[PDB]
Amino acid sequence: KVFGRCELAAAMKRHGLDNYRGYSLGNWVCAAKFESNFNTQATNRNTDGSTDYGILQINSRWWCNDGRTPGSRNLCNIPCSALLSSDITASVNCAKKIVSDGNGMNAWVAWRNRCKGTDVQAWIRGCRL
């Protein structure tokens, strides 16, 4: 399921994501926009062996569980398949353990590299948030 930019902005904002740990909602639609390009089931294989899942590309080494990463954790205690989910609740109740942990959104490299230091607001620009 490809989220519409604003359909997503809403959804995120629905799960109290909009500004969680000081990240303006525009900071999540953008990270998502690149991490996954808005595809709820965006799977990108990671070098080391790990796997980035769903909308906000949450690595399976650490957060989700996939059965294929010898010695990788599952803190959010969930099967990544549950991240690919069309409903993005999980991915978000999960993209908090990723932004609350300590490194902020610099976890999502695509945000750190493509968003961090830009017009994030210009990402919800149209969104009736």
- SS3 sequence of 78-111: EECHHHHCCCCHHHHHHCCHHHHCCCHHHHCHHH
The CATH code that applies to domain 1-129 is 1.10.530.10
7 in catalytic set: no
3-class state of residue 66 by DSSP: coil
Catalytic residue among 18, 35, 66, 119: 35
| Residue 101 among known ligand-binding residues | yes
Q: Are 61 and 73 spatial neighbours (Cβ–Cβ below 8 Å)?
A: yes
d(CA 112, CA 22): 15
What's the half-sphere exposure (Cβ side, CA atoms, 13 Å) at 20?
20
**Which amino acid is located at 45 in the chain?**
R
Spatial CA neighbour of 83 closest among 40, 36, 28? 40
Experimental method: electron diffraction
Catalytic residue among 52, 66, 87, 119: 52
66 in catalytic set: no
Spatial CA neighbour of 35 closest among 101, 124, 105? 105
Give, for 30, the enclosing helix (H) or strand (E): helix 26-35
Q: Which residues pair with 51 in a beta bridge?
A: 45
What contacts 27, CB < 8 A, 6 or more positions away?
105, 111, 115, 120
Number of residues assigned to the chain: 129
